[PDB]
């Protein structure tokens, strides 16, 4: 069973990754519960991408 040796790539270039770090965190949540988490739990509250 031979390994494939394509005479041409089926795609000219690899698809660019679109879930990069800037796309992962959208914006920080700034609410009373979020402020409680920040000042008491040492926890930051963020809204992030669903696929992350």
Partner 1 sequence: PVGGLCHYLSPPESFGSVLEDPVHAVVYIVFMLGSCAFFSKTWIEVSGSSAKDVAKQLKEQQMVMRGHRETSMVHELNRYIPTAAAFGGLCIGALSVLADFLGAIGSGTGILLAVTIIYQYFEIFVKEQS
Binding site for partner 1 (CB under 8 A): 29-32, 34-35
Residue nearer to partner 1 on the CB measure, 35 or 52: 35
User: Residues 44-51: contacts with CB within 8 Å, 24+ apart?
Assistant: 48/24, 49/19, 49/23, 49/24, 51/19
Asked if 25 and 46 touch (Cβ cutoff 8 Å), the reply is: yes
- Considering the complex, state which of residue 20 and residue 32 has its C-beta at the smaller distance from partner 1: 32
User: What's the closest the beta carbon of residue 28 comes to partner 1, in angstroms?
Assistant: 12
Of 35 and 48, which CB lies nearer to partner 1 in the complex structure?
A: 35
């Amino acid at each position: 069973r031979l390994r494939r040796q394509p005479k041409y790539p089926r795609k000219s270039a690899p698809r660019r990754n679109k879930l990069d770090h800037y796309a992962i965190i959208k914006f920080p949540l700034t609410t009373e519960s979020a402020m409680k988490k920040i000042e008491d739990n040492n926890t930051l509250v963020f809204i992030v991408d669903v696929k992350a």
